[PDB]
Design a protein around this nucleic acid. Sequence first.
RNA 1: UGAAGGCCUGUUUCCUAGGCUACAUACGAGGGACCGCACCAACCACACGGGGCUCAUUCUCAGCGC
Lengths: 674, 671
Amino acid sequence: NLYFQSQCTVRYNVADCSHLKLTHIPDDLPSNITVLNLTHNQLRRLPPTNFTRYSQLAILDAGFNSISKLEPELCQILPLLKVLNLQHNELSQISDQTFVFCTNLTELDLMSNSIHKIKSNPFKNQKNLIKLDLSHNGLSSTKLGTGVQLENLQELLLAKNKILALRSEELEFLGNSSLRKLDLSSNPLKEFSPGCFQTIGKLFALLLNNAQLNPHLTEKLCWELSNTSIQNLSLANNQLLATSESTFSGLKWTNLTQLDLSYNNLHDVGNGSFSYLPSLRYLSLEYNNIQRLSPRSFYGLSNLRYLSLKRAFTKQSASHPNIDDFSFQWLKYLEYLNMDDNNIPSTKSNTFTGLVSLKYLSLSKTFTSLQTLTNETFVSLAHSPLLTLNLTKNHISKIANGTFSWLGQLRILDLGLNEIEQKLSGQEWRGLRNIFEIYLSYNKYLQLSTSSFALVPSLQRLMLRRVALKNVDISPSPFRPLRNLTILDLSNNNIANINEDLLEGLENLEILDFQHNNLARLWKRANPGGPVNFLKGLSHLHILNLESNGLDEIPVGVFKNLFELKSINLGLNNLNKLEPFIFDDQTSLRSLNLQKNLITSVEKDVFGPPFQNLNSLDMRFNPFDCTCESISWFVNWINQTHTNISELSTHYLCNTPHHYYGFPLKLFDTSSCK
Amino acid sequence: YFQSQCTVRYNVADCSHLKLTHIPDDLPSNITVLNLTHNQLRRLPPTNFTRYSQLAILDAGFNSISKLEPELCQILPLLKVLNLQHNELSQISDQTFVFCTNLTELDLMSNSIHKIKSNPFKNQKNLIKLDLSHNGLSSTKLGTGVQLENLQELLLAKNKILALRSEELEFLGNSSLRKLDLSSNPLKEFSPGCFQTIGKLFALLLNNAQLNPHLTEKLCWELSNTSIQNLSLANNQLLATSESTFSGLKWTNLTQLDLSYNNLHDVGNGSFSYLPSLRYLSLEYNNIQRLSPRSFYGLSNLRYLSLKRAFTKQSASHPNIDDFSFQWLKYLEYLNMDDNNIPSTKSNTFTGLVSLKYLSLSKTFTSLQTLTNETFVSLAHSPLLTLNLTKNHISKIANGTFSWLGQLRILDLGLNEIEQKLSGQEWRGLRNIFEIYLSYNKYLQLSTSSFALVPSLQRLMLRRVALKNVDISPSPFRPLRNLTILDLSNNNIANINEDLLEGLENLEILDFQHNNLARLWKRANPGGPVNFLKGLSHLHILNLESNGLDEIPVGVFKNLFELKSINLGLNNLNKLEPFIFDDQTSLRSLNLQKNLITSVEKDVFGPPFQNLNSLDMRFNPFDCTCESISWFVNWINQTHTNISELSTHYLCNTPHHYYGFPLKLFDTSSC
RNA sequence: UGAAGGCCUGUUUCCUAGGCUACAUACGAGGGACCGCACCAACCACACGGGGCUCAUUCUCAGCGC
């Protein structure tokens, strides 16, 4: 799509003029503008005179053009300039006089230009520069001056260049400038001269992603990083195939906080390799090939508070990863441990010993040979105040009675996307006196029973999507004990029969999702038994979704006294007949969806009440009757209501009476009908 | 959806899928058909049909009928065809079919007649096609005297017949059976005289009958000395064959023989020596391991043969057809050989095939990758007329590979990995070529002398081949004086010199889609607007879809008086130069869907609209003002042209007061 | 010259991604004889949009070297 039209859509002092194949600078624009998003055009230069119209510009974005030369007069003509952007342009030379007049500049970007060299003090007048960018413009020396300059610099970026080493002298121009992010990623460094980083005033973060490092190189690097204030350090995308004690020997004189080692094919962690980081707090090990772990692998990290292991262990191949017991006895303050995407065979009897502060534990798709959660696979976690356990995608097939007898402090439990297939006798949840949510969606099937949920009265949420439930109509209802339940998602299970005892006593329920369950027959005027009213006394219902159940007649009385309903979704059904006064008690309705039905007439004795305060209505794809007797009131309401109706003009068509087959509803003439 | 009283038609009252329980009577008395298929009827009282004694064929399939009445026949004396499949009948008494005599076809397929003991078909002297397939029978006996004199097509599939007694078939003494279906019956015995007892037997189907070489040997020894012409043996355990396997067939004028789906493993030496009249043979979906020059010995009269998926799979076990394999099939004319794993063609494989005309090789090879000047020496003595060679991963051809097939007409080379510069010598010798199929290859580099050696070409397909070197003078297509179709489509042609297509006076179809030739058409004109459609006066259908066009030059359609279809969909046309279609008066089809057209004026669309039969211009941001669409909307109100999806896909995206307004609903009076 | 880039056009691939189709299979009702219809679900197939990426040959830079 396009419709970029001729002139650019000018807005409130933000004149975006992207993708217009411009060649000149537009001048007609008001003199009160502060922004010029000139991105994505084919300009050749910026004459500093064609901007005399508006000396009110604040930020200039001229990225994605073919600018080859800037002029010093541009700065003085635009004295209120703060941010400049010239990425993906074709500059080649920066003279000593170019940036002389720009002094209110704070951010300056020159990313994909071609400054192969710089030999001057061109940033002298830049006492307000905060974020300087030079990433990917083919440089070969980090030197940008000879005296202490850029006093208030804050975020320097030098990615994708041809820097070969960091001389001690070619960085001394940062004597008293607090660098808070020094990006140097993807620079083929080969040497770190002594004093290379100590010369900077303050250094906080440092990015050396894709810098082709090796253990020797990073050893020299770390020996040159000591005795500074570094706090974040990343080493992604390297050849750090191994580590030992001497690898990070230099880091002992720093208050390091983060350390990223992702994407290194890190193969074997040496014994005590982190003994020198008693302040590390955020560690990553993602996407590597750790073969084994020993109780010395994490020795000394007595102060960690986060750790990721997502895809950290070797692949499946007959080579299988092996984390031996007592591996985490040192991480006495750890609280989060992601362990997704691994191939650990199963949990041993002491794996998580000593983790007396673990709170959040994820295990999504970490196992290959579990298939059964017995009462001993979690004995190692008996001493951890857990608050979450993500266990999706493990091909779990069955659970034993009292597996979770240990996690007496758990809140959320995730069991979705497995092959659980058993009768929930109710003893599986033994001990979870503090459970708060349980996630069972996407399993094979479960056979509920009267005493299934009796052991977890404090439950508050419950998800049973696509689980193909059975034995759902049993008295008393298995849900009766859950006095504190609020959400229910008993959806996409295909429930043929719903005894009306279900949901009795769940007074606190607020969300009920009951889609794709083919409960059609239950609603009937033919009534083998009196029309079911399972929505008996849930007075706290807000959103009730009964979509795609082949409904064709809602009994009168099912919505009686549910005064707080906010959204009703009855889409994808066969409703055509609408009993009078079905929505008499729904006055707070804010959302109503009856799309994709067989409704032919929209009368007032049904839709008045809900229409009285509606904010959003969706009733498209319906064979409306285009006669004033069937739609006159509706069309009037459409003419005089402020409700948000989506796709009004195109998806409200009458399939009758041919004289109007295709006629837009809103266009229906109503005058001569009374 | 829509159900209601069934949609009655001209004396054909279809009332399917209505969950009926009674028989409708309101229907006229001039009806001849009742398609009562797919309902829930329990039975058919022969009195509720008294209304119309004019019925001719009754279709009561897919119901729950449990009993019919003899009075039904006499109440409906003009009944000819009956159908009761997937019903639940259980017993056929001697009096049920007594009054039906004008019956010709009778079907009782999925009923439950576990037994029949009477002469119930006595009054059936007009029965032609009787069906009893899949109703749980255990004896083919249907009577005791010669009955069903004019029977013609008997079916007995999916039953529990265990053998064919000589006596339990004698009720067909003088009835010419022309199709005796017995598929999927676990036969174990063939008593002597089993088939000779029938008057005449022409075809016989024994599909899925669990046969073995011994069983079929006894069968064939009991089939001799009859008039059988077609015989099928699909889906069996015929794991091997020898000379004695078909020893009995020597006394028959057999014509067809199907052996598909048998895991047929090894053809014995001379195993077909007894069929000097076989004319249509099949061997599909088996596991022939090897072929010997004796494998087809004696079949001196064959005229068709399929080998699709006949050879063993890839596994290190590879099929091997040795040389001189077809020296006996001196009258063969068709040979399908799809889906095999023959490594390559030897130097004598097709020797002796001096009558082969149609040869297919679609996906038969695995290790060809190069068609040299010797892979077809074995075909030097065959008047071929087709060669299907798709899906062989061919990578390159040598000069003069086709120097042998001097009588070929159609050549198929699509769906391969051909990647070379067509120097022009590849087609050496094809002085009679008629069509060449090159679509779906890697890429070809054309040259001035590419097609110079095949002047008699008439069709040419170059779809998705990613052409290069297309603008060279003179055009490589210039020599093809007889070309008619061109399909130079989906190749992305940046530059088209206007010399191309000059002299192809006989061209009728040009397909030029998905080629992003946008720039060529331009008013800015680096060079004068290209007019490659210079003098093709025989053009009928011209498809230039999806090329990012935004301005057609004036003069490109001048004097092409026979154009019948123009497809300019999926472009960026918004501006329409006056009088672009002045010479297109015979236009029958016009497609301008999915464009940026905003106004439809008369000085452009008058002429084409004058005689149009079909127009497609949907998905366009029409201007809903009478100045832009008034004439169009009037024409829509007063024209008989076929416009598809008129009422829903012709919406104005302007001027908001009408955003979404159906075009046809646009009021025009006050303009 | 080569190398390098932003502008429009579009070619291929990749999914994701939706809807619609089509197929077997299943849970149900209801009728029925000793196994045929409606609702629903998932399944895979087919057609077509929609989201990323990778090529095209044009419109124009520079930096030259000589």
